Amino acid sequence: IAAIHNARRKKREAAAAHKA
Amino acid sequence: WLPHQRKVFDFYASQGVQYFTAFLIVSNFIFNCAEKEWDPYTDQLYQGLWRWGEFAFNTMFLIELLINFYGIAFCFWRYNWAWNTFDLVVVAIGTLTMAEAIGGNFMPPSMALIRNLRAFRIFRLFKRIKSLNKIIVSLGKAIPGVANAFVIMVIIMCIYAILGVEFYHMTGSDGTYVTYNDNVKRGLCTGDEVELGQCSLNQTVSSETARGYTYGEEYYGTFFRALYTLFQVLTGESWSEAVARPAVFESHYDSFGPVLFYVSFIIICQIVLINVVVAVLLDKMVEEDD
Amino acid sequence: WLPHQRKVFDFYASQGVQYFTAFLIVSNFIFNCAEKEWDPYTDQLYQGLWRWGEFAFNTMFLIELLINFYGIAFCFWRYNWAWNTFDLVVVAIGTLTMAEAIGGNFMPPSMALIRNLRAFRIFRLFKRIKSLNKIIVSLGKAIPGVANAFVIMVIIMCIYAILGVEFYHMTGSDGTYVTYNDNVKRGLCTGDEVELGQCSLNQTVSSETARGYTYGEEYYGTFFRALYTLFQVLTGESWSEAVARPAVFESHYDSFGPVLFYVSFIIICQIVLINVVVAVLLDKMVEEDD
Amino acid sequence: WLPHQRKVFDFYASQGVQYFTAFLIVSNFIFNCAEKEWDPYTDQLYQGLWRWGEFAFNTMFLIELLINFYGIAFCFWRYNWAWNTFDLVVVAIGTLTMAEAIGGNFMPPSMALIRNLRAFRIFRLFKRIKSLNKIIVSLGKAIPGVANAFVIMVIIMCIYAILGVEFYHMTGSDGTYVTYNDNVKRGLCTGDEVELGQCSLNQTVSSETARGYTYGEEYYGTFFRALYTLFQVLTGESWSEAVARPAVFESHYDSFGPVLFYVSFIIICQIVLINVVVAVLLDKMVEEDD
Amino acid sequence: WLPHQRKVFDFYASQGVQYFTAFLIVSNFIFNCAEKEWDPYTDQLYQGLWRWGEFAFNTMFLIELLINFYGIAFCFWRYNWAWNTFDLVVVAIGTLTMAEAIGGNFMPPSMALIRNLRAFRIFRLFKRIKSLNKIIVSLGKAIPGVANAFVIMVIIMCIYAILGVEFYHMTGSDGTYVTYNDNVKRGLCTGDEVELGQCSLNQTVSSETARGYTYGEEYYGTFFRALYTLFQVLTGESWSEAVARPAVFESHYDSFGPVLFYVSFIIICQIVLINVVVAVLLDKMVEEDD
C-alpha cells in the first residue's frame, strides 16, 4: 500500500507545487 | 397526500429517531452474532430465544418501515428509492420468516439462502452514519475505474488458465510422479552402484493432494479449477510448495517451462496488475474525497 | 512549593540526566532480553542474578521517579500527566516485585500478567528521544482516521463469519469427506470397470486438521472461530490449501458457493479494505508530519 | 492504389465494424474457455464441435483481415505495422490449423506451442477498446523505467543464489539432518539419564522434501534451483517452514549464518527492492496518465 | 606526481575503458554463476577451468587497478576513497586466492567466508553505470529515514518476543497437547456415550514440528527463537497453521489470549509498521529523485 499510497502522494505535491 | 403525513415524515427524519433505528440495527447484528456464537448448532439449545428475538426485531422493523413510508405516502419512487427498496426487501424477508414461524413451512427448503439475508441488515446502518456512508459511496464510485484493469487481469488469468489446463491437466495422473536425483555427481553414491543397482537416480513421489485428487486433476483439471488455482497463486497462497514445485521438478531437463510459466504469471499478474488495480482504486477514492 | 524544589526540577530536565535515564531504560530492556535468551527456563540456572538485577533496576527507577516528582511537589496533575502516571504504574509494579522478592508471596498467583508489565518499561524511552516520540504521537493521532474503515472491515468480517458458521460448521463432521473424481472422462480408467467395481469416481479423504478438530469445527465451528479464520484469510495465510479448497471441492457440482464465498471475501476485505485502511492511516500520519 | 480500395478502407475503420470484430474476438476467447472447461480431456467428447468452431473463427478472421489489408493495398508497412503483423501471425497460425484439420498432419509434433497461440488472440481486443489500449500502452512505456531497478534486483538475487549454492547445496544430503534439543536445561529430562542413555539431546529429522529431493539438492542444488528458491522467498511463499528453518536449525550454534542470510535477503530484496520497483512502475504509469 | 601519471589518469577515465571494465565485471559475475550452475559440487568435474578462470580474472583486475592507482600516485585518499578501497579489498582477496592456488594453503580453513567475497565483485559495476549508481545512492541516503521506524519495529518485536517466550516456551512440552472437542452439543455423539466411555471430548495432538522440536521449544524456546518466529509472522509466512493455531486451540476457554496476541501483533507490526517503514523509505527515495 505504501508503494501505492506514496505514488498517489507524488501526484498531490506535484499538484501542490503546480498551484504554488 | 395524507392529512397527518408531513408530521410523521419530519418525525422519522429526526436525528434521535435515526440514532434509535441505528441502535436497533446494531442490536440485531449483535443478536445474530450471539446466535452464531453461543448456539449455532443443528440441535439448538435456546431455540425459541433466537426465534422470538428475530420475531420482535422484524416486527419493530416493520413498524418503523411503515412509519417511514407513511410520510412518503407509500410511494418510495421519488425519495431515496434505493435505500427504501433495500429496506423493503429485508423487512419482507423478516415477514416471511415470522409467517413461517407462526404458520408452518410455506416455503420449499430450496430458498434458505434468501432467509440468509438477515445477516445483511447491518448494511442499513451505513445510511444512519455519515462517515460509513461516505466510505461506501466512494468505494461504489471508484469501482468503475477499477473495471478496466480488472478485466485485463481476468483476461490474462483466463489465458494462463487455458495454458495450464493444456499443459498440466495430465500431470501426476497415475498418482505418483518421478523426480530425478543427481546423487552420483554430488558424490552421495558411487557411479558403479547406480548402474549395478544399489542406488537409483530416480524416485517416485506421490502426486495426490490433501483433497484426494492428483495434482493435475485438482489444480488444472478443468478451466475453472485452473482459474481458481491461478487466483490462489495471484493472492500468493502456497503457489510453490503445492502448485509450482511439483510441476517444476516434474520436467527432468525441461524445467524452464514451469518456472517461466509461474514466474511470468506471478510477476505480471500479481505484482504489476494487482498494484495497478489497487493504485487506480485508491486514486479514484481519494479524488472523490476532495 | 518545596524550598529546594525548583533546583531539582530543572536538574531532572537536564539533557544529560534524560540521556542517563534513557540508557537505564535501554539497559533494563537488554537485561530482560538477556534473561529471556540465556535463562528463560522454569528451572533457572542464574536465578538470583535476574532477581537482584530487577531489584536494582526498580530501586534506581524509584530514586529517579522520586527526583522527578519532588520537582513537581508530588502533584503530577498539571505537568505531563500521562507520562507521569505511566511511570508511576511501572514503578508500582517494580516495588511490588521487590516487596515479593523480600518478604514472600503477598499476591495470589492469578496476577502474573501484571508482573509482566516490566517488558513494557521500554516505552518510557520513547519520551527520552524526540524522533520516536514524533512517530508514536503520529500513530496515535492517525488511529482515529483509521477507526471508520476499521469498523467497516470488522462489520464485513462478522457478516462473512455468520455466513461461514451457517454454511461450513457441519463440514467434514464425520472426520472424512468425499471428493468426486472424473477418471472415466479423462480416460484414466474405462467406464466399464467403474460400474463393474474395479475403480470408483469417489475417493474419501480425511477432514481432520493439525489441531485434531474437523474442518468445520475448527475453522467455522463457532462465530469467534470463524472470525479468527477470516482474519487468517485476510492476512493471506494458507487460505486455500487449508481453509478454502476442502470446502470448494466438498461441493460436488455446487462449487460456485465456496469459490464465490472466498473469492469475494478476499477481494473485498483483503484487497479493497486493507489497502484503504493503510492508505488512510499513512495519509493521516504524513499530514501530521508537515 | 486499387480502384475500390478507399471505400473498403473507410468501411473497416467504421465503429460498428470495429465493435463487430471485437465481439468476434471475445466470442472466440469464450469459445476457447468453454473448450477448456467442458471438454479439455485427451479423449474429447465433442471433438468436431471445437474443431469446426476454430475452423469458422479462423475463416472469419481471414475474411476480415483480407478486408483490412485490401484497404491498405496489402502493404502493412506504413499504417499500424505492429498490430497488422500481430494479426498476420495469429491468422497464419489459424490457417495452419485449418490446413491441418483439412489435409492431415503437415507439421511435426514438436510445434504444439505455436498452435497454442490461439489463446493470445484476445490481445487483438485491446486495440478495439480505447481504455484497455491506454492501460497496456502505459504499461509498455513504464517497463523501461522498471528495467534498472529490476536488473539490480536480479543481480542481488544471483549473488544470494551463488552464496546459497555454496553453503546449503550439501545440506541434508544423507536425507536426514540432526537438530539438537536442550531438554536438560528445560527440565524435561534429568541430566543423569541423558548421559546414562534414557534420553538424548539430539533428534534426527528427515530432510527429504515433497518433491522427493533432499533440502539442499532441491532448494539450492544448482544455481538456477537456488535462483528459483530465492524468487519463491522474494514472493514470500513458505520461506520459513520449508526453505529457512531447516537450514537455520541445522546450525547447532552457528545459527546466525542462516538467520542473517534469509533475514537480510528478505529485508533488502523483498521489502526494499520490490517496493522500489513497484513505486517506479506506478510512478511512470501515472506520469503517462496525465 | 609521476611523469606519465596524468596521461594514464585520463586514460582510465575514458568511457571505452570504463565500459570494458564493466564488461569484465559482468563476465566475472557470469563466470561465477556458471560455476555455481554447471559445477558447484564438492567433487568438481572441471576444476582447473574455474581455478584458472578466477586466476585470469584477478590478474586482469590487478592490472586495471594498478592502472587506476598509477594515475592517482597510489594515494587513493583524495579521489573516490570508498570505491577505491572497495576495489582494493576485492583485488586483495583475488591475490590471496591466486597465491593459494599457486603455492599451497597459506590460510587456515576458518576464513572461507572471506574467500566468498568474489560474489560481491559485481557491486563494482554499479559505479560503471550511472542509473544503477543513482538507485543505490538513493537507497543509501533513504536508509537513515527508515532507521527510526525500523527501531520502533524492532522494539515492539522484542516486546512481543519477551511475552511469547514467557507464555508459550512451555507449550506442547510433552510433545503432545490436548484440544477439546464439542461433539455432544454438535450432535455427532450422544452425551450418554461420552460419559459412558465410547467417545471423548478431548483428543490428543502431537506438538512436534518438522524440525523435530516441540512447538514451544522451537518457535518461542528462547528470546532469539521467538524474535525469529515473530519475524516470520511479520513477513506473513505460515503464522496460523504452524505458529498461531496450535497455541490458540491449546487454550481450552482462554483462547482470547493467543488470538489477541497474534492479532494485535499482526495488525500493529505487519500492517501499521511495515507500511509506515516502506512509505518513509519510498518517500525519501523519491524526494532524492528530484
Short mmCIF file of all heavy atoms in Angstrom, two decimals, chain E residues 22-49:
data_model
loop_
_atom_site.label_atom_id
_atom_site.label_comp_id
_atom_site.label_asym_id
_atom_site.label_seq_id
_atom_site.Cartn_x
_atom_site.Cartn_y
_atom_site.Cartn_z
N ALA E 22 33.49 -2.63 -17.07
CA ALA E 22 32.15 -3.10 -16.73
C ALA E 22 31.87 -4.45 -17.37
O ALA E 22 31.29 -5.33 -16.73
CB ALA E 22 31.12 -2.06 -17.17
N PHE E 23 32.26 -4.62 -18.63
CA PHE E 23 32.11 -5.91 -19.29
C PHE E 23 32.93 -6.98 -18.57
O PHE E 23 32.49 -8.12 -18.45
CB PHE E 23 32.53 -5.81 -20.76
CG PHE E 23 32.90 -7.13 -21.37
CD1 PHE E 23 31.92 -8.04 -21.74
CD2 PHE E 23 34.23 -7.47 -21.57
CE1 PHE E 23 32.26 -9.26 -22.30
CE2 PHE E 23 34.57 -8.68 -22.13
CZ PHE E 23 33.59 -9.58 -22.50
N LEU E 24 34.13 -6.63 -18.11
CA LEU E 24 34.94 -7.58 -17.36
C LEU E 24 34.25 -8.01 -16.07
O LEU E 24 34.24 -9.20 -15.72
CB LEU E 24 36.31 -6.98 -17.06
CG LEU E 24 37.39 -7.18 -18.13
CD1 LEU E 24 38.59 -6.28 -17.84
CD2 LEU E 24 37.82 -8.64 -18.18
N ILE E 25 33.68 -7.05 -15.34
CA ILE E 25 32.99 -7.38 -14.09
C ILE E 25 31.77 -8.26 -14.36
O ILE E 25 31.52 -9.24 -13.65
CB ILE E 25 32.60 -6.10 -13.33
CG1 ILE E 25 33.82 -5.22 -13.07
CG2 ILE E 25 31.91 -6.45 -12.02
CD1 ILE E 25 33.51 -3.74 -13.00
N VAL E 26 30.99 -7.91 -15.39
CA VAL E 26 29.82 -8.72 -15.72
C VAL E 26 30.23 -10.11 -16.17
O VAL E 26 29.58 -11.10 -15.83
CB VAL E 26 28.96 -8.01 -16.79
CG1 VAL E 26 27.78 -8.88 -17.18
CG2 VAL E 26 28.47 -6.68 -16.26
N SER E 27 31.32 -10.22 -16.94
CA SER E 27 31.82 -11.53 -17.35
C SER E 27 32.28 -12.35 -16.16
O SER E 27 32.06 -13.57 -16.13
CB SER E 27 32.95 -11.37 -18.36
OG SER E 27 32.53 -10.63 -19.48
N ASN E 28 32.92 -11.72 -15.18
CA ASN E 28 33.31 -12.45 -13.97
C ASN E 28 32.08 -12.92 -13.19
O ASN E 28 32.06 -14.04 -12.67
CB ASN E 28 34.19 -11.57 -13.09
CG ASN E 28 34.76 -12.32 -11.90
OD1 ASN E 28 35.10 -11.72 -10.88
ND2 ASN E 28 34.87 -13.63 -12.02
N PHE E 29 31.05 -12.07 -13.11
CA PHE E 29 29.81 -12.47 -12.44
C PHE E 29 29.17 -13.66 -13.15
O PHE E 29 28.72 -14.61 -12.50
CB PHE E 29 28.85 -11.29 -12.38
CG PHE E 29 27.68 -11.49 -11.46
CD1 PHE E 29 27.75 -12.41 -10.43
CD2 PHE E 29 26.52 -10.77 -11.63
CE1 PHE E 29 26.68 -12.60 -9.58
CE2 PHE E 29 25.44 -10.95 -10.79
CZ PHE E 29 25.52 -11.87 -9.76
N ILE E 30 29.13 -13.62 -14.48
CA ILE E 30 28.58 -14.73 -15.24
C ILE E 30 29.43 -15.97 -15.09
O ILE E 30 28.91 -17.09 -15.06
CB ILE E 30 28.41 -14.33 -16.72
CG1 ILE E 30 27.42 -13.17 -16.85
CG2 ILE E 30 27.93 -15.51 -17.55
CD1 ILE E 30 27.29 -12.62 -18.25
N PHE E 31 30.75 -15.81 -14.98
CA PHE E 31 31.63 -16.96 -14.73
C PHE E 31 31.32 -17.61 -13.39
O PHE E 31 31.25 -18.84 -13.29
CB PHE E 31 33.09 -16.52 -14.80
CG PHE E 31 34.04 -17.62 -15.15
CD1 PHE E 31 33.91 -18.31 -16.35
CD2 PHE E 31 35.06 -17.98 -14.29
CE1 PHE E 31 34.78 -19.33 -16.67
CE2 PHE E 31 35.93 -19.00 -14.61
CZ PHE E 31 35.80 -19.67 -15.80
N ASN E 32 31.13 -16.80 -12.35
CA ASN E 32 30.76 -17.33 -11.04
C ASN E 32 29.41 -18.04 -11.09
O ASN E 32 29.24 -19.12 -10.51
CB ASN E 32 30.74 -16.22 -10.00
CG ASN E 32 32.11 -15.60 -9.78
OD1 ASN E 32 32.97 -15.64 -10.65
ND2 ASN E 32 32.31 -15.01 -8.61
N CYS E 33 28.44 -17.43 -11.78
CA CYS E 33 27.12 -18.04 -11.90
C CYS E 33 27.20 -19.37 -12.65
O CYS E 33 26.57 -20.36 -12.25
CB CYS E 33 26.16 -17.09 -12.61
SG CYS E 33 25.78 -15.59 -11.68
N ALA E 34 27.98 -19.42 -13.73
CA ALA E 34 28.14 -20.66 -14.48
C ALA E 34 28.85 -21.72 -13.64
O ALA E 34 28.51 -22.91 -13.72
CB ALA E 34 28.91 -20.40 -15.77
N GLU E 35 29.83 -21.31 -12.84
CA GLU E 35 30.50 -22.25 -11.95
C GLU E 35 29.51 -22.84 -10.95
O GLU E 35 29.50 -24.06 -10.71
CB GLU E 35 31.65 -21.56 -11.21
CG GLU E 35 32.09 -22.28 -9.95
CD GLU E 35 33.14 -21.51 -9.17
OE1 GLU E 35 33.51 -20.40 -9.62
OE2 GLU E 35 33.59 -22.01 -8.12
N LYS E 36 28.66 -22.00 -10.37
CA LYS E 36 27.70 -22.49 -9.39
C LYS E 36 26.55 -23.26 -10.05
O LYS E 36 25.84 -24.00 -9.36
CB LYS E 36 27.16 -21.33 -8.56
CG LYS E 36 28.02 -21.00 -7.35
CD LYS E 36 28.40 -22.26 -6.58
CE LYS E 36 29.45 -21.98 -5.53
NZ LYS E 36 30.82 -21.91 -6.12
N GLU E 37 26.36 -23.09 -11.35
CA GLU E 37 25.28 -23.80 -12.04
C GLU E 37 25.73 -25.16 -12.56
O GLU E 37 25.14 -26.19 -12.20
CB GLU E 37 24.75 -22.94 -13.20
CG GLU E 37 23.85 -23.69 -14.16
CD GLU E 37 22.59 -24.21 -13.50
OE1 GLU E 37 22.13 -23.61 -12.51
OE2 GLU E 37 22.05 -25.23 -13.98
N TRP E 38 26.75 -25.19 -13.41
CA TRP E 38 27.14 -26.43 -14.08
C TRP E 38 28.13 -27.27 -13.29
O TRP E 38 28.37 -28.42 -13.68
CB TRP E 38 27.72 -26.11 -15.46
CG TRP E 38 26.67 -25.77 -16.47
CD1 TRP E 38 25.90 -26.65 -17.18
CD2 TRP E 38 26.26 -24.46 -16.87
NE1 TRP E 38 25.04 -25.97 -18.00
CE2 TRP E 38 25.24 -24.63 -17.83
CE3 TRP E 38 26.65 -23.17 -16.52
CZ2 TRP E 38 24.61 -23.54 -18.44
CZ3 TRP E 38 26.03 -22.10 -17.13
CH2 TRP E 38 25.02 -22.29 -18.08
N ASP E 39 28.71 -26.75 -12.21
CA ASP E 39 29.70 -27.49 -11.42
C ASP E 39 29.87 -26.85 -10.05
O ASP E 39 30.91 -26.25 -9.75
CB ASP E 39 31.03 -27.55 -12.17
CG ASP E 39 31.97 -28.58 -11.60
OD1 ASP E 39 31.57 -29.75 -11.48
OD2 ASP E 39 33.11 -28.20 -11.27
N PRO E 40 28.86 -26.95 -9.18
CA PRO E 40 29.03 -26.50 -7.80
C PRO E 40 29.40 -27.59 -6.82
O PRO E 40 29.51 -27.32 -5.62
CB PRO E 40 27.64 -25.94 -7.47
CG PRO E 40 26.72 -26.85 -8.20
CD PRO E 40 27.45 -27.27 -9.47
N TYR E 41 29.60 -28.82 -7.29
CA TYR E 41 29.70 -29.98 -6.42
C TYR E 41 31.02 -29.97 -5.67
O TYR E 41 31.97 -29.27 -6.02
CB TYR E 41 29.55 -31.26 -7.23
CG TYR E 41 28.39 -31.22 -8.21
CD1 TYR E 41 28.52 -30.61 -9.45
CD2 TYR E 41 27.17 -31.81 -7.90
CE1 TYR E 41 27.47 -30.57 -10.34
CE2 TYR E 41 26.12 -31.77 -8.78
CZ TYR E 41 26.27 -31.16 -10.00
OH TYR E 41 25.21 -31.13 -10.88
N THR E 42 31.08 -30.76 -4.59
CA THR E 42 32.33 -30.92 -3.86
C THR E 42 33.38 -31.61 -4.72
O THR E 42 34.55 -31.20 -4.74
CB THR E 42 32.10 -31.70 -2.56
OG1 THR E 42 31.23 -32.81 -2.82
CG2 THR E 42 31.45 -30.80 -1.51
N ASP E 43 32.98 -32.66 -5.43
CA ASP E 43 33.84 -33.30 -6.43
C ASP E 43 33.60 -32.59 -7.76
O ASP E 43 32.79 -33.02 -8.58
CB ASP E 43 33.55 -34.79 -6.53
CG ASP E 43 34.31 -35.60 -5.50
OD1 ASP E 43 35.47 -35.25 -5.21
OD2 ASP E 43 33.74 -36.59 -4.99
N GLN E 44 34.32 -31.49 -7.97
CA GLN E 44 34.16 -30.71 -9.18
C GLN E 44 34.71 -31.46 -10.39
O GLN E 44 35.76 -32.11 -10.32
CB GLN E 44 34.86 -29.36 -9.02
CG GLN E 44 34.15 -28.43 -8.06
CD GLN E 44 34.37 -26.97 -8.38
OE1 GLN E 44 34.99 -26.63 -9.38
NE2 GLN E 44 33.85 -26.10 -7.53
N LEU E 45 33.99 -31.37 -11.51
CA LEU E 45 34.36 -32.07 -12.73
C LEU E 45 35.38 -31.28 -13.55
O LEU E 45 36.40 -31.83 -13.97
CB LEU E 45 33.11 -32.34 -13.58
CG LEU E 45 31.92 -32.97 -12.84
CD1 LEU E 45 30.66 -32.77 -13.65
CD2 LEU E 45 32.17 -34.44 -12.57
N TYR E 46 35.12 -29.99 -13.77
CA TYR E 46 36.03 -29.10 -14.48
C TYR E 46 36.60 -28.15 -13.43
O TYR E 46 36.10 -27.05 -13.22
CB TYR E 46 35.31 -28.37 -15.61
CG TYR E 46 34.26 -29.23 -16.29
CD1 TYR E 46 32.92 -28.87 -16.29
CD2 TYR E 46 34.63 -30.40 -16.94
CE1 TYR E 46 31.97 -29.67 -16.92
CE2 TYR E 46 33.69 -31.20 -17.57
CZ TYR E 46 32.36 -30.83 -17.55
OH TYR E 46 31.43 -31.62 -18.18
N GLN E 47 37.68 -28.60 -12.80
CA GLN E 47 38.22 -27.96 -11.61
C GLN E 47 39.18 -26.83 -11.98
O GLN E 47 39.00 -25.67 -11.58
CB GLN E 47 38.93 -29.02 -10.77
CG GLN E 47 38.42 -29.22 -9.37
CD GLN E 47 38.95 -30.51 -8.76
OE1 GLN E 47 39.74 -31.21 -9.38
NE2 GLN E 47 38.51 -30.82 -7.55
N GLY E 48 40.21 -27.18 -12.76
CA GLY E 48 41.13 -26.18 -13.24
C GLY E 48 40.47 -25.11 -14.08
O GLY E 48 40.96 -23.99 -14.16
N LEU E 49 39.33 -25.43 -14.71
CA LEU E 49 38.64 -24.44 -15.52
C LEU E 49 38.28 -23.22 -14.68
O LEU E 49 38.71 -22.10 -14.98
CB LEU E 49 37.40 -25.07 -16.16
CG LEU E 49 36.68 -24.37 -17.32
CD1 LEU E 49 35.73 -25.35 -17.99
CD2 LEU E 49 35.91 -23.13 -16.89
#
